[PDB]
């Protein structure tokens, strides 16, 4: 399914952005 494929990939990208965000914060505080 094409909408499901876009959605699953987009969520994975969102989860990775959040991880990077949490990592950068750890190297600050």
**With the C-alpha atoms ordered 8, 12, 17, 28, is the resulting torsion angle positive or negative?**
positive
Contact of residue 29 among a second copy, Zn ion, none (CB under 5-8 Å per partner type): none
User: What gap in Å lies between CA 29 and CA 5, rounded to an integer?
Assistant: 36
> Residues 1-29 vs a second copy: string with x where CB under 8 A?
-----------x---x--xx--x--xx--
| # residues near Zn ion by CB under 5 A | 5
CB nearer a second copy, residue 2 or residue 27: 27
CA dist 13 → 3, 16, 28 (Å): 15, 5, 23
Footprint of Zn ion on this chain (CB under 5 A)? 1, 3, 10, 18, 21
């Amino acid at each position: 399914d094409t909408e499901k494929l876009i959605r699953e990939k987009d969520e994975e990208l969102r989860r990775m952005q959040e991880m990077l965000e949490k990592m950068q914060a750890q190297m600050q505080q």
